[PDB]
């Protein structure tokens, strides 16, 4: 659904911070000058300059404390060089409503600790160093109170504002482009029919190969691929015997077509 997150990528000693609304980036952190960078005018949303500075400041301190507070405990913790720590935090909306929030930390690409309720909890998988890592974090509760306030009251207020602020950007409809092609030969006597749908927005889409109304199973949906303009691209393929091919057509359903689907016949 609709989800704003802030991600952290720690390498060991660079450090990256960005803020994303789903697949779309909206915030960047300037390494040199310690500053939240808005990528859209409405990147800022409800908040005001007063607040933003206050938050930016809060992000500077807290990140520092967390960063220096690792090579401080890197040795005590099993953590051996080199390694990467990944943090994702934020909140989501299920049809215009606050559908909960999250904050998860990852060691080496596998889950490590999660923030639940008012404190840190280990993933059982990550073993007995994860359980130790929590004992450290949970030691000062006031730290946990602040984490909690941001996840469950700051973030929800924020995302709502953002949404409203960029209702001209998101909520917009960009009509898709549709064309057909051969794929790699699956074997003698057969073909791969390839339906191309490119440059559509928003992201949900329906693409299926059709024999009249006979929705052909075996239609095979590919990755939804991005472009720098925020639009999406998608291939749907079908393997057929050569003769079967002319009977076939491609049907594309998208929000911007408003009921008038795209139909491409193989002939």
């Amino acid at each position: 659904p609709l989800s704003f997150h802030v991600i952290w990528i720690a390498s060991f000693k660079q450090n990256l911070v960005s803020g994303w609304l789903s697949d779309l980036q909206t915030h960047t952190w300037d390494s040199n000058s310690s500053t939240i960078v808005f990528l859209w005018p409405w990147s800022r949303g409800n908040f005001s300059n007063e607040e933003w500075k206050e938050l930016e400041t809060l992000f500077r301190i807290r990140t520092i404390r967390s960063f220096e507070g690792i090579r401080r405990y890197a040795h005590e913790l099993q953590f051996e060089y080199p390694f990467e720590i990944q943090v994702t935090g934020g909140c989501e909306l299920h049809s215009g409503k606050v559908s909960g929030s999250f904050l998860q930390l990852a060691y080496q690409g596998s889950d490590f600790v999660s923030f639940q309720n008012n404190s840190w909890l280990p993933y059982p998988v990550a073993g007995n160093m994860a359980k130790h890592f929590c004992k450290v974090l949970n030691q000062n509760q006031h730290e946990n109170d602040i984490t909690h306030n941001l996840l469950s009251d700051t973030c929800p207020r924020f995302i709502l504002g953002l949404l409203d602020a960029g209702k001209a950007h998101l909520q917009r409809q960009v009509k898709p482009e549709a064309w057909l092609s051969h794929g790699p030969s699956p074997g003698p006597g057969h073909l791969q029919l390839v339906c191309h749908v490119s440059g559509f927005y928003p992201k949900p889409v329906w693409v299926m190969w059709m024999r009249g109304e006979q929705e052909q199973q075996g239609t095979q949906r590919g990755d939804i691929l991005p472009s720098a303009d925020g639009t999406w691209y998608l291939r749907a393929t079908l393997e057929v015997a050569a003769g079967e091919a002319a009977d076939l057509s491609c049907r594309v359903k998208h929000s911007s077509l408003e009921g008038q689907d795209i139909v491409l016949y193989w002939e």
Partner: T-cell receptor
Amino acid sequence: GVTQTPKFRVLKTGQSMTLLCAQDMNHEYMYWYRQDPGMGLRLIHYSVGEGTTAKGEVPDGYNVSRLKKQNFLLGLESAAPSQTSVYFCASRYFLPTQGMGAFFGQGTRLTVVE
Amino acid sequence: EVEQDPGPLSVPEGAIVSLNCTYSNSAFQYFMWYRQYSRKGPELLMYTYSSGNKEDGRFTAQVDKSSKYISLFIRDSQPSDSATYLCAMSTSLPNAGKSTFGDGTTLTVKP
């Protein structure tokens, strides 16, 4: 901790004065309150760091100056009888770790007379 | 806004004293109690985050967010407790470091 200077002062109506608050506690946030007897604290001005300041609930007739991190000056532009009150300076970390709450000075008793 | 029982309170030594504030703004999340002795400055006495109780010696701070009602309880009140008690509250972050003060309650404990 948090110190205020002067501790007492008398002003003829119309005169000016500067109050000076200092703290050696390395605090980012600083505050000037006034307190009238029976009542609580009303915020006049405050500062979130060196060189920036902002208006509180009752800012009129006062100005402030956050010169260093340590010092926060309060200034009476033109004394009026209404400004007869007790003034409290306060500071606190930006992101304290042992809970919220601010540290307070012992106060400045100021009386304006005609 | 923060409405606080004006008092004054005069209780005998040994009594349980109850000090209370009411607020109207639901955004409030940080709750502070200050104690201020005569001719001196406010001193933080109790602090609590969100809903709940915190017990420190003879003192219990209590916050009821749904009722918008907070309370400082003093057990076995000593004459040394005679002072003014002020409550203060901050809203969720970002809160600008600002807090709103009730107008205080002055408590006298008769020895």
